[PDB]
Amino acid sequence: APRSVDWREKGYVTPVKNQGQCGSCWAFSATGALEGQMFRKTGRLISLSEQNLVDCSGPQGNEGCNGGLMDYAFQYVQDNGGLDSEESYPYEATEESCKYNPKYSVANDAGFVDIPKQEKALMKAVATVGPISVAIDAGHESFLFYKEGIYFEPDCSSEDMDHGVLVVGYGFESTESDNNKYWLVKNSWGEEWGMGGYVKMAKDRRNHCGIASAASYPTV
Ligand SMILES: *[C@@H](C(=O)OCC)[C@H](O)C(=O)N[C@@H](CC(C)C)C(=O)NCCC(C)C
């Protein structure tokens, strides 16, 4: 497979968003993955509504600002027959009653694919599909203060993930330790966090922070 992938250069990726103080990481991960697959299909990049997911995908198992899962979001879009655009259903960082309106739907999916729990399988998916939804252990102060370089947290867990994010590619850069490979990850904490809102997370370092343990994408 390729040594370097960046789906932002192919037009698959919207700008970095900010979930605020709502526990809706799962919705931002899911919209990011669906934005990529919809672009793959139609050639149009349209920002999608996280609030739509927060308010409306409870029946699929999500819990609004109290948490959720990207697969449940993908199941909602399939079950519901649509998902509204960001512009039409903007983000409020709080859970309200469902206000979905199919007239303003701009996306659909026919299910989702869970990737085997191996970084090699994740690499194949990123290389051939587009941006991929992933879960990571972000529960460390080092992640809060990340600025640049390849993120490696020795206390990171590969089994207990708490934050859904989006892999938009992978690459390499020479480092002191010769652990040079990284996943290119879009976060949802605004562009002031990390490197314009992105983090390079250690790749092929024993599933660091669990990035390959719960990876998936929607079928479009
Ligand atoms: C993620 C978030 O906003 O983190 C703060 C930045 C949420 O807390 C969240 O939904 N977490 C989620 C696991 C992620 C998606 C890997 C979770 O804890 N889900 C629990 C089960 C769910 C069915 C309610």
Domains of the chain: 5-219 (3.90.70.10)
Q: What is the DSSP letter of 85?
A: B
**Which among 25, 56, 156, 209 is annotated as catalytic?**
25
The question of whether 187 is a catalytic residue gets the answer yes
Does the C-beta of 161 come closer than 6 Å to ligand 1?
Answer: yes
Residue 181's CB: how many other CB atoms inside 10 A?
19
Identify the sign of the CA torsion 27, 93, 64, 208: positive
Tell me whether residue 87 is annotated as binding. Answer: no
DSSP state of 15: P
C-alpha dihedral, 18 to 129 to 133 to 31, nearest 10°: 40
Q: How many CA atoms lie within 13 A of 121 on its CB side?
A: 15
For residue 61, give the ligand 1 atom closest to its CA.
Answer: 23
What's 24's DSSP letter?
Answer: -
Specify the experimental method.
Answer: X-ray
Question: Which is it for strands 181-186 and 198-202: parallel, antiparallel or unpaired?
Answer: antiparallel
Element (H, E) at 216: strand 216-218
Resolution in Å, one decimal, please. Answer: 1.6
- Beta-carbon count within 10 A of 96 CB: 11
